[PDB]
Amino acid sequence: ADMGEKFDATFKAQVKAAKADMVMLSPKDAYKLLQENPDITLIDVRDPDELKAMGKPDVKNYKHMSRGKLEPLLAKSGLDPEKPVVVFCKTAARAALAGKTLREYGFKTIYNSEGGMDKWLEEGLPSLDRSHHHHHH
Amino acid sequence: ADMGEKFDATFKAQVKAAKADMVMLSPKDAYKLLQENPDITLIDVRDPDELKAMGKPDVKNYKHMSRGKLEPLLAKSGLDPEKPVVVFCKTAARAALAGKTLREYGFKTIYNSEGGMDKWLEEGLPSLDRSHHHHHH
């Protein structure tokens, strides 16, 4: 009555395969091609409160696709299977669902961003954040 | 040119399969089994920041499993494939990944919560939220 350890290994086997499905990059390597090639778009999948409180990537070619998992919003942004795209927030937000799907449909070059939103802010990458110092408590 | 019409339906097919691989129950029926039977645990899989702001389900046996997709926390929660569990927030956070994977391991009864966090608050269900009573302008 304690099979928590038993199935845990399997869960990690399934979930990790989702990041393995596509080309795993790093937010710097991803931004590199983003800023140089305005045709390569980054699609961020994260909730509005963290985006508001902590910040989100500041990129010229940025599409934030929310809904439940960008499903109905995908066509709304304007995407074609010959366009290179990268997804942010792989783990918690599950960018793996956002990106690995597209390549499973027929997208040329799709990248997944290792780490997450925390890596964007921390790696010194261009972020759009409401930097405010008017607060003590 | 544009393949929006094409993949929009496909993405909806894959994302929908995730709700289909679960027993879809409404938060009222979900909380019912939770509050009456403390063996049926509800697992909330969502971000803590929006949780802080909007509120989270205040049930007797609520466990927040926060990782990439609850994988490493599922082992430490004290769960056994003889217990029924329901996953809340099938929307953006996609609790469907939490529950649909578990049935692949042989759980007793796994439910997915129709609607989402919005349905919990809207239904006036037991929630733990910090009333924003510090704003008059």
Residue A117 has phi, psi (to 5 degrees) of: -60, -35
Contacts of A66 in chain B (CB under 8 A): 92
Given a contact cutoff of 8 angstroms between Cβ atoms, the answer to whether B100 and B21 are in contact is yes
Residue B109 has phi, psi (to 5 degrees) of: -140, 115
Among A residues 44-103, those touching chain B with beta carbons less than 8 Å apart: 47-50, 53-54, 66-72, 74-76, 78-81, 90-94, 97, 101-102
What sign for the dihedral angle of Cα B31, B100, A101, A110? positive
B118–A contact, CB cutoff 8 A: no
CA distance B34 to chain A (A): 20
- A72/B8 CB distance under 8 A: yes
The DSSP element (H or E) to which A16 belongs, if any, is helix A4-20
Give dist(CA B50, CA A95) in Å, integer: 18
E-assigned strand segments in chain A: 23-25, 41-44, 56-57, 62-64, 85-88, 110-113, 127-128
Would you put residue B103 in left (φ > 0), alpha (ψ -120 to 50) or beta? alpha
The percent of chain B in helix, strand and coil, each rounded to the nearest 5, is: 40, 15, 45
Given a contact cutoff of 8 angstroms between Cβ atoms, the answer to whether A74 and A53 are in contact is no
Smallest CA–CA distance from A3 into chain B, residue:
B80
Helices of type H across chain B? 4-20, 27-36, 48-54, 71-74, 96-103, 117-122
What sign for the dihedral angle of Cα B62, B63, B66, B72? negative
Contacts of B82 in chain A (CB under 8 A): 1
Give dist(CA A37, CA B134) in Å, integer: 46
Least CB-CB distance to B12: which of A50, A71, A93?
A: A71
Contact residues for A132 (Cβ-Cβ < 8 A; gap 6+): none
- B105/A2 CB distance under 8 A: no
**Method for this entry:** NMR
Structure tokens at B18: 């995730």
Give dist(CA B118, CA A47) in Å, integer: 14
CA B47 vs CA A15, A48, A66, B95: distances in Å: 18, 11, 14, 11
B130–A contact, CB cutoff 8 A: no
Give dist(CA B129, CA B53) in Å, integer: 7
- B7/A105 CB distance under 8 A: yes
Q: Which CATH class is domain B1-137?
A: alpha beta
Q: Which DSSP state fits B118? A: H
The percent of chain A in helix, strand and coil, each rounded to the nearest 5, is: 40, 15, 40
State whether residue A33 is helix, strand or coil.
Answer: helix
Length of chain B: 137
Of A117, A43, A130, nearest in space to B47 by CA: A117
What are the domain boundaries of chain A? 1-137
